[model samples]
Target: PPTNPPTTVTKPAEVPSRIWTYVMNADNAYGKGGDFALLLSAVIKKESYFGDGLSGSPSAGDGLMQVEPNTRNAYLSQFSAKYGHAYNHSSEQDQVYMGSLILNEKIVRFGSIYSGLLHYNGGDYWYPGATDSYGRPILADQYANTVYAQYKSYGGRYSR
Candidate 1:
């Protein structure tokens, strides 16, 4: 399923270094190389700015990936059992794995990176109901645009 098994990063020893480490780990674990790491770097930048709490808001999402507790809790037991991580506000590994799992699921279901990203941002409702300028089911312009802009600006450096 993983199209490209990228060179994973190690050594969390610099500013933004740990962030890359987490992304690479999640990328490998989820079999989502290709553009996922770069895409997720944009998500991380837009989501939490890689903050200490890694929270999107005061009480919304958490950790480096800004995974909402509600979303994570939906599969809490499964994720915990599989990853051996407690569903808590801490744990960068937990946040990254959960977020990667959600994205990978979306991508698999929607059959495209763009549509999956829309689902990742706006959920199932937006993913299926979306329409492109040509009437095909395409990624939503709102959230997807922002992410793509950031992704392009970063020169596709992160995901691989």
Candidate 2:
């Protein structure tokens, strides 16, 4: 089966201007571009609805990227080593940057956007019964499909 959904509507208005700004900044800083920015925007929309539903639990995720604490710390360590600064998870800008970094790494590792997104969600791309550490199904394929749909809606084109 194909990785992406069958149909999608291009609706840039669905993403907030602030998100665009942050995504652009992250993209520019990280050597990424428009398509990557759009993908990050889609992730932000799907992950936390632009921060409206940010979780406070340490065990859960934080900020718009919805990255877990352990993952955030690891990313931060790498980020600080490379950039000479640490990002705070409480800040939206930092969250977008950190999230973009994580996604970019996964994309590079998996060699495709679809597989990267599936791994980013902690799901097995080839496993229908993929689950999280808690043993609850993560529905990784659906998650990737939905994010891809959102990416298409935001005019994203870099699937590979």
Candidate 3:
């Protein structure tokens, strides 16, 4: 069960806005999925409640990816780094960059969207109770449904 209901944030008029940047950037990271906006919106919703419902430093898993403190600087330095985005996750640009990085790393490293999610939830700490073994959490099973709901909310435009 979601701890909080998703509070809707209207899409901006400009493509350069954080939402657009996130969709576009996350597209590069997640790649060839249904609308990234829809997919990530739910994940983002579950992560930080659309920038609400957090109990720590905003950047401490803040924004779209629920960014972790240790990863904050790296998110900001994307463009400055080999990954090639100079996002300042603390800023509009950086948040999307970092979010995209989180999704992308998981997809490539774990080889699936769900596994990527496990990586995000546990970092290196755990996976389905994985200890040097990749554990699969039952709650993680709900992710596809969550993303699907987000897609419906985001106008439900998607393709395989």
Candidate 4:
């Protein structure tokens, strides 16, 4: 191996124990990597506060990852055809996998972590000057910043 080459980075040991296993396996399989897995833990904390039973909001939110129903269906339709197995939203494990995939998809589309996360929360309106529910600025007070802030608090060790 080239000595100057970048080494493989892994998730930090400070990852919260509550969502550790789920995020580890799910992110490893579908997410960008270990850093992203840690970000997913931040997301989980915001989504459900580590409560497994809390599947609130949008009627579609479910499990620890709080995957939206329509998003899950869209993911399942494409994923089943591509992977040859159904992705069930009812399963927390499945939710984590799909959530990571969705986040990855958004990042690819938006071309940056901030914009991708804004889109993840605000959808088509996740632009710089748009406003969403309760008049929160799309790039200011919505889900993106919340998740980002949580990541910093939870030991954000890499840039996405």
Candidate 5:
């Protein structure tokens, strides 16, 4: 977590209201809970500008969820093996929907927020490093603190 973490703490995060709108739209498309959608959206916004979560190299990640090739390949199998819906890059909502599903898996896998975030960063797990989108490492605690703050802020708007 960087000291003095940004109120939102993650890069590519839109203004709170804007991010909220995106999450709502995604929720409608995926029929996921708002909390899960927000968690996925915030992670994506923090990791990538929702750029197909592709990090370029095979070792990097891609898409709105930044699903690494490892994870992405597994996700690809979901549709193929199950004969489910098509996987597409053009469909931004679909990308987010997939990301949310992945996040849900992690939430259950780790059984705790800290471990889940660590898994999200693609490091050695347990929050590999607390780097923002800029590749600068900060304090993990601070980063999470800010996320919790924004998460708190997310509640009231849903009722509006």
Candidate 6:
């Protein structure tokens, strides 16, 4: 865990109930039960305030999860190609579904939710102030810390 956790973490009031429903539904359909739902809820909260902020673009990212076009395409190419379920970045349900899938993939690959979240945001599991090979700052550690705090506030049970 990060040394300084957030003091107060709560879901923003501007988010719609439908968004929460979409999260839960996607979690149940594609995630690892309640924990996944909670983690994803926090991720969504941090990512786009449940789609309240941020303009959509192919390069910048999209929807409630702020999923990048390449990420979305990869998931679709693998999962959609196998399951035959069509996905759209413009749809809230699709966005949540894709987000849940990506989160699960990261969690499994990285071997822990925290590390998985770090990679989810293009960060490595290391201290703050670290940089990538290109010299850009790697803020994924901070991003993971924040989302983990929000996950706890949302009643997530995972300790790591």
Query: Could you report the Cα RMSD, in angstroms, for every candidate shown?
Result: 7.8, 7.3, 8.9, 5.5, 9.6, 7.9
Q: Compare candidates 4 and 5 on lDDT and give the better one.
A: 4
Name the lDDT value of residue 159 in candidate 6: 57
Which segments of model 4 are wrong by more than 4 Å?
Answer: 1-18, 30-33, 52-61, 81-84, 127-140
Ranking by lDDT: 2, 6, 4, 1, 3, 5
lDDT of each: 0.64, 0.75, 0.55, 0.66, 0.52, 0.71
Summarize candidate 3's per-residue lDDT along 1-160 as a digit string, tens digits.
Answer: 2323353334433222545556655555545443565556656667665566466743444565566555666545554573564655557546655666666676577776556665656564553533221222334435555655665666645433
Could you estimate the TM-score for every candidate?
A: 0.68, 0.80, 0.57, 0.70, 0.55, 0.74
| Model 2 C-alpha lDDT versus the unseen true structure | 0.75
Runs in model 2 with CA error above 4 Å? 1-11, 54-61, 123-136
On lDDT, the leading prediction is 2
Q: Arrange candidates by TM-score, highest first: which order?
A: 2, 6, 4, 1, 3, 5
Q: What lDDT tens digits, residue by residue, belong to model 1 across residues 9-97?
A: 32223228677777777776666543566666777776677665443345334567656566777878777776676765577766777
Better of 2 and 3 by TM-score: 2
**Number of residue pairs clashing in candidate 2, backbone atoms closer than 3 angstroms, sequence gap of 3 or more or interchain:** 0
Give the residue spans of candidate 5 off by over 4 A.
1-22, 25-33, 50-61, 79-83, 123-149, 156-160
- Estimate, for each residue in 1-160, the C-alpha lDDT of model 6 and write its tens digit: 2323353223344446787677767666754455667788888887887766566533335778766666687778765763357887767888888877787778878898888888887733556677644455668878889998888777787854
Per-residue lDDT tens digits for candidate 5, residues 1-160, read 4645343323224535444555556555545445545655556556564454445634233555555555655677664443257766456555665665565455567676554554545433435355544455645455454544554554422311
Q: How many residue pairs clash in each candidate at the backbone level?
A: 2, 0, 11, 0, 14, 0
